[PDB]
Swiss-Prot record, chain A:
Effect of substituting residue 34 to R: Reduced monoubiquitination of FANCD2
Subunit structure as annotated in this protein's UniProt entry: Belongs to the multisubunit FA complex composed of FANCA, FANCB, FANCC, FANCE, FANCF, FANCG, FANCL/PHF9 and FANCM. The complex is not found in FA patients. In complex with FANCA, FANCG and FANCL, but not with FANCC, nor FANCE, interacts with HES1; this interaction may be essential for the stability and nuclear localization of FA core complex proteins.
Naturally occurring in which organism (per UniProt): Homo sapiens (Human)
Protein name: Fanconi anemia group F protein
Domain of life: Eukaryota
Swiss-Prot record, chain B:
Biological role: DNA repair protein that may operate in a postreplication repair or a cell cycle checkpoint function. May be implicated in interstrand DNA cross-link repair and in the maintenance of normal chromosome stability. Candidate tumor suppressor gene.
Subcellular location: Nucleus; Cytoplasm
Transmembrane segment boundaries: none
Subunit and partners: Belongs to the multisubunit FA complex composed of FANCA, FANCB, FANCC, FANCE, FANCF, FANCG, FANCL/PHF9 and FANCM. The complex is not found in FA patients. In complex with FANCF, FANCA and FANCL, but not with FANCC, nor FANCE, interacts with HES1; this interaction may be essential for the stability and nuclear localization of FA core complex proteins. The complex with FANCC and FANCG may also include EIF2AK2 and HSP70.
Known tissue expression: Highly expressed in testis and thymus. Found in lymphoblasts.
UniProt-recorded name of the protein: Fanconi anemia group G protein
Gene name tied to this protein: FANCG
Effect in UniProt of substituting residue 77 to A: No effect on BRCA2-, FANCA-, FANCF-, nor XRCC3-binding
Effect of residue 81 to A: No effect on BRCA2-, FANCA-, FANCF-, nor XRCC3-binding
Disease link: Fanconi anemia complementation group G: A disorder affecting all bone marrow elements and resulting in anemia, leukopenia and thrombopenia. It is associated with cardiac, renal and limb malformations, dermal pigmentary changes, and a predisposition to the development of malignancies. At the cellular level it is associated with hypersensitivity to DNA-damaging agents, chromosomal instability (increased chromosome breakage) and defective DNA repair.
Residues of the full protein shown: 303 to 462 of 622
TPR repeat boundaries on the chain: 38-71
Length: 165, 150
């Protein structure tokens, strides 16, 4: 209805909603609306633009939801893929390996753990082929960027690629 | 010690009561314990390495391993006793010596042959994927360490 009105742009309505109502609920709802087939997909087409415009919401979008939902979203909308891997690629890099417990960990408490990040990459790899090659190349290019090791304790990306197999 | 090895290189029961029959077989604290050529060639090599004569120690240790592992046909030459080092520790000492000499490309062939020969004993390193509980003796780790410094 706002689109047909054309008075104010949809993004302004959505930004106001974002301040107004509960965020956790809202994000699940956006995720779900991105996948409902059209009935008149201009709706979903608007939300992708809004999300790519607003980085802060997308930081909590990918962070709060479960894995398969984000996977299906990203496979439906290829415009969300290159940013999502970029979000994940930045969360790994701020981990550190401790030798006594064989687990990558973060410094700050709000840094994504190993298990959640593994779950996300596993879901992305268990997906259609158009995204599998994307994530795989993004991981290999980030491995070689940090020394092309083939042994654990040195690169989170080597450790991911080892755990996928 | 150099002389003692060459000395040990060279190899009657009377119907009567002699002294030898009554004297006890000697212990390890005694000065009359003298092990075999191999168990003394290891003393020479160990004492040559503890002082900083590592080139000489390398030749001594390779001579030792030649004795121990080329022993199929002739009379046997045993390894040191199990107060002293176990048979992997001997290889490690050899490789340390070869590093200090400047023979790292031989200190890798030592370590490769050691892991080749004990492959069946090494753990399968599938716990590497699953990450205190499993078992690995020190010498496997130490092998990779020397293999690195090389």
């Amino acid at each position: 209805e706002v689109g047909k009105a054309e008075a104010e742009r949809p993004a302004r309505f959505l930004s106001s909603l974002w301040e107004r109502l509960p965020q956790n609920n809202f994000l699940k709802v956006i995720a779900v609306a991105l996948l409902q087939p059209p009935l008149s997909g201009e709706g979903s087409q608007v939300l992708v633009h809004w999300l790519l415009g607003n980085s802060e919401v997308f930081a909590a979008f990918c962070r709060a939801l479960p894995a398969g939902l984000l996977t299906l979203v990203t496979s439906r909308h290829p415009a969300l893929s290159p940013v999502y891997l970029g979000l994940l690629t930045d969360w790994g890099q701020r981990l550190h390996y401790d030798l006594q417990k064989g687990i990558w960990v973060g410094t700050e408490s709000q840094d994504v753990p190993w298990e959640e990040l593994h779950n996300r990459f596993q879901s992305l790899c268990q997906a259609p082929p158009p995204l599998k090659d994307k994530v795989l190349t993004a991981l290999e290019t980030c491995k070689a960027q940090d020394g092309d090791f083939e042994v654990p304790g040195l690169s989170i990306w080597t450790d991911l690629l080892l755990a996928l197999r | 010690l150099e002389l003692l090895v060459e000395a040990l290189n060279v190899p009657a029961p009377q119907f009567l009561i002699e002294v030898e029959l009554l004297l006890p077989p000697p212990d390890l604290a005694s000065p009359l314990h003298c092990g075999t050529q191999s168990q003394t060639k290891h003393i020479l090599a160990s004492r040559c390495l503890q002082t900083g004569r590592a080139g000489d120690a390398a030749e001594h240790y390779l001579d030792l391993l030649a004795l121990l592992l080329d022993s199929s046909e002739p009379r046997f030459s045993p390894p040191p006793s199990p107060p002293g080092p176990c048979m992997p520790e001997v290889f490690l000492e050899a490789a340390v010596a070869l590093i200090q000499a400047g023979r790292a490309q031989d200190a890798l062939t030592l370590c490769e042959e050691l892991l080749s020969r004990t492959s069946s004993l090494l753990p399968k390193m599938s716990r590497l994927w699953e990450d205190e509980l499993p078992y690995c003796p020190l010498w496997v780790s130490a092998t990779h360490l020397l293999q690195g410094q090389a």
